[PDB]
Scaffold this active site. Sequence first.
Site, PDB file in Angstrom:
ATOM      1  N   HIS A  43       0.820  -1.210   0.000  1.00 22.11           N
ATOM      2  CA  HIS A  43       0.000   0.000   0.000  1.00 22.11           C
ATOM      3  C   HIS A  43       0.852   1.257   0.000  1.00 22.11           C
ATOM      4  O   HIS A  43       0.328   2.365   0.023  1.00 22.11           O
ATOM      5  CB  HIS A  43      -1.042  -0.011   1.131  1.00 22.11           C
ATOM      6  CG  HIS A  43      -0.503   0.139   2.516  1.00 22.11           C
ATOM      7  ND1 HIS A  43      -0.356  -0.926   3.381  1.00 22.11           N
ATOM      8  CD2 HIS A  43      -0.141   1.243   3.211  1.00 22.11           C
ATOM      9  CE1 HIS A  43       0.093  -0.485   4.545  1.00 22.11           C
ATOM     10  NE2 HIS A  43       0.247   0.827   4.464  1.00 22.11           N
ATOM     11  N   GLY A 144       2.660   5.601   9.909  1.00 22.83           N
ATOM     12  CA  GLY A 144       4.032   5.563   9.446  1.00 22.83           C
ATOM     13  C   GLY A 144       4.814   4.333   9.849  1.00 22.83           C
ATOM     14  O   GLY A 144       5.980   4.195   9.457  1.00 22.83           O
ATOM     15  N   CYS A 146       4.088   1.144   9.116  1.00 25.68           N
ATOM     16  CA  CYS A 146       3.985  -0.038   8.267  1.00 25.68           C
ATOM     17  C   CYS A 146       5.342  -0.360   7.660  1.00 25.68           C
ATOM     18  O   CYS A 146       6.159   0.523   7.388  1.00 25.68           O
ATOM     19  CB  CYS A 146       2.930   0.177   7.183  1.00 25.68           C
ATOM     20  SG  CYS A 146       1.289   0.055   7.931  1.00 25.68           S
TER      21      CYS A 146
HETATM   22  C1  S9U Z   1       0.813   1.796   7.992  1.00 26.10           C
HETATM   23  O1  S9U Z   1       1.796   2.571   8.615  1.00 26.10           O
HETATM   24  C2  S9U Z   1      -0.479   1.922   8.804  1.00 26.10           C
HETATM   25  C3  S9U Z   1      -0.317   1.413  10.249  1.00 26.10           C
HETATM   26  C4  S9U Z   1      -1.561   1.703  11.087  1.00 26.10           C
HETATM   27  C5  S9U Z   1      -1.941   3.197  11.217  1.00 26.10           C
HETATM   28  C6  S9U Z   1      -2.407   3.399  12.664  1.00 26.10           C
HETATM   29  N1  S9U Z   1      -1.900   2.233  13.375  1.00 26.10           N
HETATM   30  C7  S9U Z   1      -1.423   1.261  12.527  1.00 26.10           C
HETATM   31  O2  S9U Z   1      -0.956   0.204  12.959  1.00 26.10           O
HETATM   32  N2  S9U Z   1      -1.506   1.160   8.168  1.00 26.10           N
HETATM   33  C8  S9U Z   1      -2.634   1.697   7.638  1.00 26.10           C
HETATM   34  O3  S9U Z   1      -2.824   2.939   7.693  1.00 26.10           O
HETATM   35  C9  S9U Z   1      -3.661   0.769   7.009  1.00 26.10           C
HETATM   36  C10 S9U Z   1      -3.619   0.903   5.497  1.00 26.10           C
HETATM   37  C11 S9U Z   1      -4.507  -0.107   4.773  1.00 26.10           C
HETATM   38  C12 S9U Z   1      -4.125  -1.544   5.107  1.00 26.10           C
HETATM   39  C13 S9U Z   1      -4.435   0.054   3.264  1.00 26.10           C
HETATM   40  N3  S9U Z   1      -4.978   1.188   7.505  1.00 26.10           N
HETATM   41  C14 S9U Z   1      -5.238   1.068   8.846  1.00 26.10           C
HETATM   42  O4  S9U Z   1      -4.568   0.501   9.694  1.00 26.10           O
HETATM   43  O5  S9U Z   1      -6.375   1.692   9.133  1.00 26.10           O
HETATM   44  C15 S9U Z   1      -6.813   1.668  10.482  1.00 26.10           C
HETATM   45  C16 S9U Z   1      -8.269   1.956  10.643  1.00 26.10           C
HETATM   46  C17 S9U Z   1      -9.099   1.334  11.747  1.00 26.10           C
HETATM   47  C18 S9U Z   1      -9.297   0.858  10.315  1.00 26.10           C
HETATM   48  C19 S9U Z   1     -10.525   1.210   9.515  1.00 26.10           C
HETATM   49  C20 S9U Z   1     -11.844   1.142  10.276  1.00 26.10           C
HETATM   50  C21 S9U Z   1     -12.237  -0.305  10.567  1.00 26.10           C
HETATM   51  C22 S9U Z   1     -13.507  -0.405  11.394  1.00 26.10           C
HETATM   52  C23 S9U Z   1     -14.661   0.323  10.733  1.00 26.10           C
HETATM   53  C24 S9U Z   1     -14.274   1.762  10.425  1.00 26.10           C
HETATM   54  C25 S9U Z   1     -13.024   1.826   9.588  1.00 26.10           C
END
Ligand code: S9U
Lengths: 302, 302
Positions: A43, A144, A146
């Site tokens: 991603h 940040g 990931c």
């Molecule tokens: C990468 O650095 C990032 C790590 C995350 C961010 C906050 N803590 C972490 O561990 N990963 C992402 O941003 C990831 C990206 C997708 C896989 C493409 N998205 C992510 O972790 O999103 C988190 C939010 C909670 C989820 C979406 C909700 C789920 C429940 C319903 C409402 C939306």
Amino acid sequence: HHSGLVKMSHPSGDVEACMVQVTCGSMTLNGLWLDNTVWCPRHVMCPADQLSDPNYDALLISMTNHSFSVQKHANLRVVGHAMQGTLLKLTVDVANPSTPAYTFTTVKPGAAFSVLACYNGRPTGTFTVVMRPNYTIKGSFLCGSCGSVGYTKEGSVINFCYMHQMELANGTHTGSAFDGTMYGAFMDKQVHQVQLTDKYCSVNVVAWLYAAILNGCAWFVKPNRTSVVSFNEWALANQFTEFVGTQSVDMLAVKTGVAIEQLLYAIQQLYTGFQGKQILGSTMLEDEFTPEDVNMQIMGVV
Amino acid sequence: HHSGLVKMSHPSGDVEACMVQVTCGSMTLNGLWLDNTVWCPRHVMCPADQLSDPNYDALLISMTNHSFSVQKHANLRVVGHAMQGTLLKLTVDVANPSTPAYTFTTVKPGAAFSVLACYNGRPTGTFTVVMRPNYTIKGSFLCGSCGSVGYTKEGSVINFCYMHQMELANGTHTGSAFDGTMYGAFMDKQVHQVQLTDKYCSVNVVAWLYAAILNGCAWFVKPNRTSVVSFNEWALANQFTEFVGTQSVDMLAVKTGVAIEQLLYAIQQLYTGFQGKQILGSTMLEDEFTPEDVNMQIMGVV
Ligand SMILES: *[C@H](O)[C@H](C[C@@H]1CCNC1=O)NC(=O)[C@H](CC(C)C)NC(=O)OC[C@@H]1C[C@H]1CC1CCCCC1
Ligand SMILES: *[C@H](O)[C@H](C[C@@H]1CCNC1=O)NC(=O)[C@H](CC(C)C)NC(=O)OC[C@@H]1C[C@H]1CC1CCCCC1
């Protein structure tokens, strides 16, 4: 009394020397540089507006080698790119001169591993977690992070098992193995996803009760026994993993003179309540320590 | 729900590059090689039969430079030796080319630091602990671990604060600062020693209750307030440290809109019992996380 147990991570230096920053112009995240390959979450290719339903195949096609900026904190020239599952494999023109001996493995529920949390290619902290029965970990990750990696170590050899991808709605975390599969049934999309129910890791609860005995705390031990087969039937009805014995548990049984089946009975009783008592300062069952943790930290046995 | 809190250590690579083995022919333990100096516990000079009442001044006089064998896993030629408190300062003929930027500091009760556990000069694990109010730590150390080091990190600068010396009868640990003083009233002699009573670290309990609020867990918050002065009077009668506010706590108060004095009242009530409820999955007060841990891990603020 203190049990002698702490959350112990491997020393992180060998993995710190493998971390880089990967940028596509939208996201910046971390990568793992081994030999001529940089691994990172796919991603990184995603613009922020599309994290909820990314078409990674189309994004991949749209990239060229110079779509990727890899920096060590050096610039690493990308000369090939490919996608494997939820990971990208970037080929770079320089082999990491600090590449450790390594393998890729998948970790199983209940097993512990070390995490090196990184931001912008910079290691910032290390911690240990156990893979939960529902294929999440209870980590500490922010935007940040990931591409942060999880690993175990056998001798000099680093077994990489986890690359961080996402946080779930309940604050737990998950990621991929280096075969590109996500742990569990998760997808690397920022949308609601069903989460399997977590469970107590029975083998680790047994390990912790053995640590208690090794510390002179054995009030919960009776002659009463529950067989493995009977306990596992109970476990399925009570949010416990089925118990599978190992040589590491057997070593704890030998050292303490307490049978596994005595502690399976104890768990069944303790699950219903500690009746105002404590075990190693806790009023609930602890499943975050493994048999191997107890053997190593208390007995000196690796 | 998971709070997002883990026991987070600094990455250990910079300190791993400073660890050596020191031998006198009786004991082998670890040393810390910075610039042209190797620091190690003075009981390396002790034969095993004399660990209970060592005369370190006489042992020191009896040594020469070649009484000490220093090895990195290189042999480091010792060209000077001196004793400072409970530590030896060995001067070696080669400056450590991997010496990080560093200082020496003392850690105070309630503050966290990272430990690199080492055996025979080899780093084996890392973990984080808080200095207890009675100047012990709840560590994980076995025979051969002395000379393992504890440190914090400000930027690139490593602040070394702890060199491991001994285990107490209750399984806790203590060691020295790099001024050679032992933490607390402890002596580096293998004999019974009175242990001061431990206490709950009030500032860290407040930090943890703020982490709970930041996670949406605030059932314990009422308009009721206890002033700092009144709480500290209570604390002295109830095995709590006196509370001293810091800017890191103030930042948590601002973010949550909950006053410190509301959580001092909450603590007084929670101390008497959780009444069947849990806070971040615990039925007792947690004092092993600092305000700075909560700010960094949950809010991203260093
Ligand atoms: C990468 O650095 C990032 C790590 C995350 C961010 C906050 N803590 C972490 O561990 N990963 C992402 O941003 C990831 C990206 C997708 C896989 C493409 N998205 C992510 O972790 O999103 C988190 C939010 C909670 C989820 C979406 C909700 C789920 C429940 C319903 C409402 C939306
Ligand atoms: C150095 O590696 C070593 C570390 C110890 C060993 C086990 N766990 C540790 O953390 N330190 C020592 O061996 C130390 C040496 C003296 C300071 C000279 N001795 C030590 O830690 O001894 C531990 C035993 C428990 C204490 C003695 C008892 C106290 C209570 C009454 C009975 C004796």
